[PDB]
């Protein structure tokens, strides 16, 4: 085959990851995979120093930006957090932050007419298709590590299939009978 | 793997501690732990000889210096102090000094746009997350001695996790079907 | 029948028809799958080919 080089500007290489603590290790592996492949992944564990200054400001920095692609790491505990992190648990701080992020994503999704432009749900090894929040089921749900190539393609904003250019309508020959 | 020694200048090794009496028993052990690890911890009990000359000047020296990291020892009596030392606690001098320090911290925190650069809340054994003053809940909260290594890392201004360097965007190969 | 469908779409595109199929419209389809389907279901002028 032939080699194609992406023109993705560095401004469009930002990525933000939201997850639950049950999938922390696989999230670290996923972050390594994204970083080595050139994507600037913003995650709490790695930006701990900056995140400590003002946690809410740090989250809002990525939630405001329309050009940042948010990756949602789906796991059994993610749905649990975004549903009852405050009541079903003994006030888990990370769960509450994840719930806040999910609410902001939902608000943005609704205000846009229920169109998902930059939220990418990813299923992790112990996750099931039932764990995806309903509004996120209306888009491409990737699985990790199964579809990591597809995740890279999506982040690169490239088509997995190159449709050849549309040709001209065929010319018709007329024969008598 | 390979060992690492922080190149932290002795200027950045200054640490100031504010606490309440109930937690003083463990604060002594905490100060010993920090001194063993090479930090210049300034606390009233050990700085007594210099502090005796002028208590207010002694406090102001650490409050003015932006480079001095302040550790807040959170305990049930700490919130009670910083909320009602003057009236509810029969005019406790140490409580009053703690309240004054807290007010100075809040004033600086507000002046900076509600961004916390050098105030480190630490939860001591008899404390709970509810005891942390609200503005201090917006940053990392460390439990002692549960997260002592994390406290050391923070004082060293080092990241517990170091992300791999960002690579170049992957090249895409085109294969006809 | 995915592979033969890809060949069929090649055949249609080469001959000048704008074929909307999920695998090629992945970028737009990802925004809202149901809206993407309804766009072609509503339009009375879009011919639907059913690959049996």
């Amino acid at each position: 085959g032939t080699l194609k080089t992406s023109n993705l500007p560095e401004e469009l290489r930002k990525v933000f990851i939201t997850y639950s603590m049950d999938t922390a290790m696989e999230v670290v592996k996923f972050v390594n995979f994204l970083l080595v492949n050139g994507f600037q992944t913003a995650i709490d564990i790695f930006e701990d120093r900056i995140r400590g200054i003002d946690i809410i400001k740090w989250m809002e920095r990525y939630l405001r930006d329309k050009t940042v692609m948010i990756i949602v790491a789906i796991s059994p505990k993610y749905k649990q957090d975004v549903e009852g992190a405050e009541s079903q648990l003994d006030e888990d701080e990370h769960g509450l932050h994840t719930k806040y992020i999910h609410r902001m994503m939902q608000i943005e999704f609704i205000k846009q007419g229920s169109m998902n432009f930059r939220f990418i749900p990813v299923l992790f090894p112990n996750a099931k298709k039932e764990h995806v929040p309903t509004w996120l089921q209306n888009t491409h749900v990737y699985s990790w590590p199964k579809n990591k190539k597809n995740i890279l393609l999506r982040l690169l904003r490239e088509e997995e299939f190159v449709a050849p250019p549309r040709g001209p309508l065929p010319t018709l020959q007329v024969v008598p009978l | 793997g390979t060992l690492k020694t922080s190149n932290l200048p002795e200027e950045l090794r200054k640490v100031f501690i504010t606490y309440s009496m109930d937690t003083a028993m463990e604060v002594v052990k905490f100060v010993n732990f920090l001194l063993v690890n090479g930090f210049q911890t300034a606390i009233d009990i050990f700085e007594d000889r210099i502090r005796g000359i002028d208590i207010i000047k002694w406090m102001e020296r650490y409050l003015r210096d932006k480079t001095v990291m302040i550790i807040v020892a959170i305990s049930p009596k700490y919130k009670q102090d910083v909320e009602g030392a003057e009236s509810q606690l029969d005019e406790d001098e140490h409580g009053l000094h703690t309240k004054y320090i807290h007010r100075m911290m809040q004033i600086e925190f507000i002046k900076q746009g509600s961004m916390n650069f050098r105030f480190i809340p630490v939860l001591f054994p008899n404390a709970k997350k509810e005891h942390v003053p609200t503005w201090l809940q917006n940053t990392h909260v460390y439990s002692w001695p549960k997260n002592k290594k994390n406290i050391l890392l923070r004082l060293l201004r080092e990241e517990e996790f170091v992300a791999p360097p960002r690579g170049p965007l992957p090249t895409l190969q085109v294969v006809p079907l | 029948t995915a592979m033969e469908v890809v060949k069929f779409v090649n055949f249609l595109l080469v001959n000048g028809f704008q074929t909307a199929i999920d695998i090629f419209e992945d970028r737009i389809r990802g925004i809202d799958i149901i809206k993407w389907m309804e766009r072609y279901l509503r339009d009375k002028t879009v011919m639907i080919i059913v690959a049996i």
Binding site: K149, P164 | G1, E160, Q173 | -
Partner: peptide
């Protein structure tokens, strides 16, 4: 018109992963 203009699938050729480290004091 002949179907020579085939559809092509795009894949990322070179990739790498790992290299995460954690400080243990």
């Amino acid at each position: 018109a002949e179907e020579g203009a085939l559809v092509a699938a795009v894949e990322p050729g070179p990739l790498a992963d790992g290299a995460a480290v954690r400080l243990a004091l």
